[PDB]
Symmetry: C2
Subunit: 49 residues, 2 copies
């Protein structure tokens, strides 16, 4: 069940957009990025699962 994280870089303008949204009420940049990756993988690399 354990899993660590990795530091990566992303365009500042994209980061700013998520930062602003998660700052409103509920949300976390890390969670958004993970979800964004999961959707990318499901879309372009479906041969995963």
């Amino acid at each position: 069940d354990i899993m660590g994280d990795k530091t990566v870089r992303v365009r500042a303008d994209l980061h700013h957009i998520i930062k602003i949204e998660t700052a409103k009420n509920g949300g976390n940049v890390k969670e958004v990025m993970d979800q964004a990756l999961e959707e990318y993988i499901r879309k372009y690399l479906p041969d995963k699962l």
Copy 2:
């Protein structure tokens, strides 16, 4: 001209992208950016 910011992502998802990108030859950052931009245009239209 556009700078970058750091973010923490799940290690398993990163590994999957790293393996896949290594095949073709590109870099992980381009994938992170595409993944995030697509998420934004989908759930946060008009922000870009």
